[PDB]
């Protein structure tokens, strides 16, 4: 089934939707609208995403 | 509005949703459920998400 494609397609849809919410957030809160905002979010994302993923997976059991 | 919480809540939302799809994918394709799966899938999703994120943000700002 191509597990990579699976990951990529769901990641694409999630990232696209978020990118819109992101731009919406920066327009409503211009104080956060800097050139490194995306980089900051990305750091929070990598960390939090992998941790929550691991906990949700082990929790889905039942 | 707290920046940390904004980022954390969206990151969490994304992880919870994909964890569900991941589990559902491994149920329909058990051959893929191995001790390496969790790390492989989550990391590949996370890398692609970030790449796509940057691209859509730019596309949206220019438009």
From Swiss-Prot, chain B:
It is found in: Cytoplasm; Cell membrane. Belongs to the SH2B adapter family. Tyrosine phosphorylated by JAK2, KIT and other kinases activated by B-cell receptor in response to stimulation with cytokines, IL3, IL5, PDGF, IGF1, IGF2, CSF2/GM-CSF and cross-linking of the B-cell receptor complex. It comes from Homo sapiens (Human). Adapter protein for several members of the tyrosine kinase receptor family. Involved in multiple signaling pathways. May be involved in coupling from immunoreceptor to Ras signaling. Acts as a negative regulator of cytokine signaling in collaboration with CBL. Binds to EPOR and suppresses EPO-induced STAT5 activation, possibly through a masking effect on STAT5 docking sites in EPOR. Suppresses PDGF-induced mitogenesis. May induce cytoskeletal reorganization via interaction with VAV3. It comes from the Eukaryota. This is SH2B adapter protein 2. The modification Phosphotyrosine is found at residue 32. Homodimer. Interacts with KIT/c-KIT, SHC1, EPOR, PDGFR, VAV1 and VAV3. Interacts (via N-terminal region) with SHC1. Interacts (via the phosphorylated C-terminus) with GRB2. Interacts (via its SH2 domain) with EPOR, INSR and KIT. Interacts with GRB2 after B-cell antigen receptor stimulation. Interacts (via PH domain) with VAV3. Interacts with NTRK1, NTRK2 and NTRK3 (phosphorylated); after stimulation of the receptor by its extracellular ligand and subsequent autophosphorylation of the receptor. Binds INSR, GRB2, ASB6 and CAP. Insulin stimulation leads to dissociation of CAP. Transmembrane segments: none annotated. Expressed in spleen, prostate, testis, uterus, small intestine and skeletal muscle. Among hematopoietic cell lines, expressed exclusively in B-cells. Not expressed in most tumor cell lines.
